[PDB]
Amino acid sequence: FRVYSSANNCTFEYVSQKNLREFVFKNIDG
């Protein structure tokens, strides 16, 4: 992919090893 040019100063790096897909994103209290 070509999503970013550079990545640095990582704080939190988490990895996980006919249809409607719904998400609700909420940023509260950090």
Partner 1 sequence: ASVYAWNRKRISNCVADYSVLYNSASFSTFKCYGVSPTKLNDLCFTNVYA
- Interface contacts to partner 1, rule CB under 8 A: 11-12, 14
- Of 3, 11, 4, 17, nearest to 30 by C-alpha is 11
Q: In whole angstroms, what is the distance from residue 12 CA to residue 19 CA? A: 31
Joined tokens for residue 3:
């999503």
Residue at token pair 């209290």: 29
Q: Which does 8 bind (CB under 5 to 8 A by kind): partner 1, ligand NAG, none?
A: ligand NAG
**Residue nearer to ligand NAG on the CB measure, 10 or 15:** 10
CB of 8 to ligand NAG, least distance (A): 3
Ranges within 1-30 binding ligand NAG (CB under 6 A): 8-9
